[PDB]
């Protein structure tokens, strides 16, 4: 059909069919007569997989050959998402897969729509870690993802009478025709236990036992015929646990819950134990996995020539701890020497600076769980410690605030103290927010090393995120420049020249009323509901979060709604806003703002003299498969974090190269994409973080906003009179409270600025020619955002090996 | 290599290796070079289960379309064990794959050895109803067989210091290519709750919801191209079960603990509620299966004429009242007219009448957890204690005697009453059996209804006990009779006329010491241990159970050392006693009988005056794989239980196809195997079941018999004195206490003549000529026992259908 999507070959398209046919057959053991949908799905996911196979087996061989640098990926969370399309895409089968599927009498997007999602992950970091696997695949690295095969992975969102509900994410259950396991590879891991300090040292003895059953998933490059692992470890209890009989066997569950499923926190720490052991589970396995890599190529000098491994934030901290466990306790190396290994090979990746996100594990957690981690964690301290005291003598209370031990109530040990420290590369996702972890979290840190300290701009992979989710602008984009694009976003640039050309104007905006089109049609298929289409489509998908502030959103839409109310019969552009996320289970607030979100609706939705000028959808169950829909659509991207708060964000970078305007604060990575598409080219507003801190210095006092603005005063007050909720007139107290009197945020301070800003985004709206200009010239210039940058930016100064864009024999 | 192994084809061979290396590449994922013995037999297994697809697929769709009877056969307990081997012995594919490997430079029997056992059974009950499954699909019936997939099925045993160890069975570790799931056919199963009475009918409200998941596994008819299927269900909880949040998800193990894992209880009732569950669970998912396939064929007056359910023992006793419930409250069908159905629907097979074997259960459990079946049940006895009223005016006793509810400290619901009552048929598994069923614990219900009753002795295959495992005797009888007689046993009766024949002689001797001698191998190389393979070889394996009456063969065992050790240099035939069986892991005695056993090897194996004239061997782990290996090995079969204990017995009908000859009581099974093959080819001794009622009627006293037996006396002095066990004088003091005290089973009753017929064993054994002639006799009229008999007989005499042994087109 499209020429971005590959040839279908006579041959090609003949063999697949037969393959199908073959995997109906003797797969699936059925035949066309009972065969139902998802049969179809399958037999087409195990054709596509098995062109995998032979590039899988190959691609492993040469690493073995060839020897290369390793790189280690270590994360507790993958957003993967669907992977029968994308494979199609990397693989250039698309077209014939499509066609073959046609020829069979099936429709394959049909099908496609049956793959449940791999959510192995819960928002911005877990995406993060998907997109670079695909990078690191398509830029020849040989870089293995490890991480945990969560049985259940992010919860299923329901909305029931406006409220979210949670249900569990039994993804597993038709089975995962990508997976491989690997029985063979089994390895144990310790918990609990003691340490005993022998002749020649310290043993961990008496400890619980778990086996680490690795999956491996295949990740395959863009059209390079390179396929990476992703190696995923699953819980497993030894068979002798526990060995009444009935009761042993029943309580094997207890070891087999470490990888049951996803705690569902976004950009928040929750200390439970449970947590934990995943913490050190993914580690433990992972590291003996490494190392018996390299002792297949004694000479552990060479360890940090042969490895490299990335933490992705501080969730696989104790990879630190466990390696210098592994060197000194069992492999006799000394103290020294092994650190000088464990720094020369660990590299550390912060995402956040929100206080309640930061990792700090209490003393007495570890002793118990860990108790050799513990005693190794306070010998590196004490090192470390006296490594500041000589840089800088005298100074008692920088000694405490860089200490790995936190005093206290509780003692805990500051899980990114100890990244730092054990750490040759700490970088941050975004300039600003690199900047600001210099400036005031890991200030001391990097007055003591400031060679260590690196940033590494989040990006995202052209393939899933355009090609593959909207292949129409693709297209379009090829018809002019080529295909080389997909794979060198850089040259998105070329389009510039055709700012001006009356053909590609036509083209741009006809590619994103298609995609309006057919999302609009889906919201009335699988929810049912109407909405218009020559509307603007203002949306802000992202997990619920205070600090998000999809609640100032909130407020300009009520604004609308009021204004609409106050001078019906006047002209105001059409607007379909669109808010969509999860919050986690125990995040009350955020519960609180779904539960506003859709009230707000209930009333907007239904005013007959707000005709179609105005709706408010509240957008279930968002997640990477929805992303892929949605975001094409989108004309509007909402990222209104609160400036400071937003590491990077990557869904940004997403609205940018799928032709959506940007609406948005300072925070970020927006603070680049401005800078790159230029600020005439990017709708921002509200304060910069000097600004923020200037306020919190004076002291931010919510009431004088509310004083001085009339149309915030009416919003605040419809919301405590009940306005939103008739039969329950104070349900949102507790939001007008929080607003009023302790918001962390500073909602009100942007509201002002955000709704003039609003006004102008909807008057550019009014001249489709210039708005789609605009368009084409933040698409020309999301080419810095390709994760395949990122990537290249951290194989070279970081992890110390060359990409490479050369094909492997097919 | 051997002609009833297959012919070895040219197209055939070729086409086996090229798919062998498609599922090693595609499949598997893996190449000539890092492949392990596992991965080859992997490769090899699903090589040939994709020629079972084919025949599986058309079996199905045939019954679809000519609509037959259904036969459903349901069990909690398939003791399955490998089904590589007999998959390729049934598909004539042996020979071909052997070669085929051979080609490949592979040795297909060591391939085989790498499979698990399907060990979903705990003996005689669960190896029946696998024989039975291979039997139904040889003789061509419709028939289903319907159980639990336990993930955990009887426990490997381990000996540690001479005592029992039990570890969990995870034969699914590396996954299991014969099963194919089918979540698409996921049922919903009711727990709890409480009936509401409404004004029409009863409903069962406010209960709790477990899925019942199908995986669906091929059972091939011997060479006739049919292939039926074993449905075994998995517990899963719904998606919004217990739907803080991550506790939610972990507490869904409690719903899957269902089918988590098997009892090992042999003989024995335990009343917990989890095995009710299972009962239920069983049950309920079945029996909708059954109702959709008959609809999808409302006039429930054909159902029986439609469908057959075959409840092996009372464990699925459920499917009459749950039939009922259905019938009654789904479907509207008035009672009568309901039990009407049920009848004609169901039959029974009772394999015990051991007192503690039977399953009474408490009215307050099934109370809580089956409200509406209690009910249910209440009414079936009422109605059914009227007709008994109405039959023996006045006999209140028989009232109570009869009664399905048993009165005393707790309620409880006698099952078998219910199961008799509400079934058209009834039967015992061996003539005399099925007669003291009629004498004793059924007498009221024979007198009632004689027409129920019936007997229908057991059988075994031939395909897996002969072929299969005894591949050179079926190839020496195969060169003189032809090879029909694999499935038309009777035929075995021809070798009459070869008893005189000197060379048929020497070839049966040949087979019988070359499976000795591989067996002997085998003992060294996986548990190190030397035996003389020109000694007898004596076995007696089989679950450890005080009924069994190892005891008695301890006894003997003793007496051989005790005579040695007196005349040193007096001649006696060398023997190797083997005893092999688990223990139920809360069946004290039984584990102590297993101490006792290692302990005589220790003391006599290691005793320089024997020397290799008497060797005490444990068999470890005894299942069926092990069984398939030492029966073709056995010159004695020891089936020595108490007269009127064992009901009939399997494992003598192995013993007896297998070339051994048999010393046991006229019990069970032994009784018609005698008679068969003459008493004079037999070794039969001990009390008949009349002389054991004198004994009680008298009082046993084992007293009399220490009294009056010197070397039984001197038996019992070395037991208790600590000869036996060293450092632990009174390590034996419970079983010596119990053999004096209260012995159930008359152990020193049969001692006399147990030990005299012992003795005219070993003569004939002195003489090669008529020992061998003596097994001829044995061998050729084993014919009666194969389950092709049994099978017919139930179909003609229970399910009203026709057995077929015409071939369906491949
Ligand atoms: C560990 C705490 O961080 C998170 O939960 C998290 O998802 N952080 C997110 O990581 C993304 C990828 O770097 C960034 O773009 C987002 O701004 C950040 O909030
Ligand atoms: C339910 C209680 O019965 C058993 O546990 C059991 O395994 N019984 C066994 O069933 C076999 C097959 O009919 C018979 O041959 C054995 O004699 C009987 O003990
Ligand atoms: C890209 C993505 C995210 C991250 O979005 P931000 O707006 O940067 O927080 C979260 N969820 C999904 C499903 C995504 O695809
Ligand atoms: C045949 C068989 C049985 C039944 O043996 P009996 O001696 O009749 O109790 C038990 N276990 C296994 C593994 C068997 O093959």
Redesign the pocket.
């Known amino acids: 059909q499209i020429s971005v999507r590959g040839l279908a070959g006579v041959e090609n398209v003949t063999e697949l069919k037969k393959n199908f046919n073959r995997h109906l057959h003797f797969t699936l053991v059925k035949d066309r007569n009972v065969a139902t949908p998802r049969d179809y799905y399958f037999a087409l996911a195990h054709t596509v997989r098995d062109h995998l196979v032979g590039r899988w087996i190959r691609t492993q061989q040469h690493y073995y050959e060839k020897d290369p640098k390793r790189i280690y990926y270590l994360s507790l969370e993958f ?1 993967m998402g669907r992977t029968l399309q994308n494979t199609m895409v990397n693989l250039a089968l698309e077209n014939a897969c499509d066609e073959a599927t046609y020829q069979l009498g099936l429709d394959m997007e049909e099908l496609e729509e049956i793959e449940e999602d791999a959510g192995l992950g819960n ?2 970091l877990g ?1 993060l870690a998907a997109c670079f696997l695909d990078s690191m695949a398509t830029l020849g690295l040989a870089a293995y993802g490890y991480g945990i095969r969560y049985e259940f992975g992010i919860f299923n969102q329901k909305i029931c009478g406006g409220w979210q509900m949670e249900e569990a994410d039994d993804w597993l259950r038709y089975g995962n025709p990508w997976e491989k396991a690997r029985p063979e590879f089994t390895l144990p891991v310790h918990f609990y236990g003691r340490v005993e300090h022998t002749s020649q040292g310290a043993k961990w003895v008496d400890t619980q036992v778990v086996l680490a059953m690795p999956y491996d998933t295949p990740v395959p490059g863009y059209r390079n015929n390179v396929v990476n692992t992703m190696r995923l470890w699953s819980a497993k209890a030894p068979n002798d646990f526990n060995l009444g009989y009935i009761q042993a066997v029943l309580d094997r569950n207890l070891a087999e819950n470490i990888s049951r499923v996803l705690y569902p926190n976004d950009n928040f720490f929750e200390g439970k134990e449970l947590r934990l052991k995943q913490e050190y589970f993914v580690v433990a396995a992972t590291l003996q996995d490494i190392i018996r890599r390299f002792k297949s190529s004694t000479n552990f000098d060479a360890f940090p020539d042969k490895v490299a491994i990335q933490l992705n934030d501080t969730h696989p901290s104790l990879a630190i701890p466990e390696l210098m466990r592994v060197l000194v306790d069992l492999e006799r190396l000394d103290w020294d020497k092994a650190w000088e290994v464990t720094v020369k090979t660990c590299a550390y990746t912060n995402h956040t600076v929100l206080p309640e996100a930061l990792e700090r594990w209490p003393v007495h957690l570890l002793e118990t769980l860990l108790p050799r981690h513990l005693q190794i964690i306070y010998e590196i301290n004490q090192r470390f410690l006296n490594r500041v005291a000589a840089a800088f003598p005298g100074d008692v209370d920088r000694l405490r605030r860089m200490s790995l031990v936190e005093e206290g109530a509780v003692k805990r040990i500051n899980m990114a103290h100890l990244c730092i420290a054990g750490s040759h590369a700490v970088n941050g996702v975004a300039r600003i927010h690199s900047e600001i972890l210099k400036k005031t979290i890991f200030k001391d840190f990097y007055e003591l090393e400031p060679h260590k300290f690196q940033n590494k701009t989040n990006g ?1 992979t052209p393939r899933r995120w355009l090609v593959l989710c909207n292949p129409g602008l693709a297209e379009i984009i090829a018809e002019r420049i080529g295909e080389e694009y997909i794979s060198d976003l850089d040259q998105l640039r070329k389009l510039l020249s055709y700012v001006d050309d009356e053909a590609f104007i036509r083209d741009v905006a006809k590619v994103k009323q298609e995609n309006k089109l057919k999302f609009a049609a889906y919201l009335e298929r699988e929810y049912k509901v109407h909405i218009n289409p020559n509307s603007l489509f203002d949306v802000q ?3 619920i979060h205070e600090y ?1 502030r999809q609640l100032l959103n909130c407020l300009h839409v009520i604004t609308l709604y009021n204004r609409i109310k106050k001078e019906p019969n006047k002209f105001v552009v059409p607007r379909t806003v669109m808010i969509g996320g999860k919050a986690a289970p125990g995040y009350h607030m955020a519960k609180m703002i779904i539960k506003l979100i859709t009230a707000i609706g209930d009333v907007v939705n239904h005013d007959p003299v707000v005709g179609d000028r105005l709706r408010v959808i509240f957008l279930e169950n ?3 498969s929805l ?1 892929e829909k949605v975001i094409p659509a989108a004309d509007l991207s909402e ?1 209104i974090s609160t400036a400071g708060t ?1 590491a990077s ?4 970078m ?1 609205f940018m190269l799928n032709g959506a305007l940007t609406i948005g604060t300072m925070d970020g990575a927006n603070v680049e994409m401005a800078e790159e598409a230029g600020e005439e080219n990017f709708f921002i507003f509200g304060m910069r973080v000097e600004d923020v801190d200037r306020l919190d210095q004076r002291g931010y006092n919510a009431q004088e906003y509310y004083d001085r603005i009339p149309e915030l005063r009416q919003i605040i007050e419809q919301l405590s009179s009940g306005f939103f909720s008739p039969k329950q007139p104070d349900l949102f107290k507790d939001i007008v409270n929080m607003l009023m009197h302790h918001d962390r945020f500073k909602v009100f301070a942007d509201y002002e600025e955000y709704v003039k800003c609003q006004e102008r985004v909807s008057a550019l709206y009014k001249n489709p020619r210039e708005w789609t200009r605009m368009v084409i010239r933040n698409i020309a210039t999301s080419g810095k955002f390709s994760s395949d940058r990122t990537i290249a930016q951290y194989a070279r100064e970081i992890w110390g090996v060359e990409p490479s864009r050369q094909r492997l024999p097919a």
């Open positions: 957003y928002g911005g995406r995202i998908v992202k997990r998000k968002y997640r990477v992303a990222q937003e964000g990557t869904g940004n997403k």
